[PDB]
Amino acid sequence: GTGVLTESNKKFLPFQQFGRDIADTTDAVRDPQTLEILDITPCSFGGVSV
Amino acid sequence: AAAYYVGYLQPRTFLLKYNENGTITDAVDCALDPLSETK
């Protein structure tokens, strides 16, 4: 999918790999090789009004 | 001076509360008492 990868401060557990939220969507993943918790967030979007 | 408490599992539904730190703090049996079903 698409999303901005930023360094997150959410501390995970040694057995956790994915991350959900209240909306039941992915918002944080663990990198496979270099273990580090990221923060997946969609790009900028909105409505064009004229 | 040893003692174990072997129990048996069964298919149940539980409403787990996840803390902000990512740990489970409470849970609801969802079928024990009517208050649990309401919660």
Binding site: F12 | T13, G22, I24
Partner: peptide, 25 residues
Amino acid sequence: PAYTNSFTRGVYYPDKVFRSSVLHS
């Protein structure tokens, strides 16, 4: 034999998904 009541014990992490401030079922 003897018996003992399990006072709200035996709860484990169901999956390997992180959740914060979420009441999942």
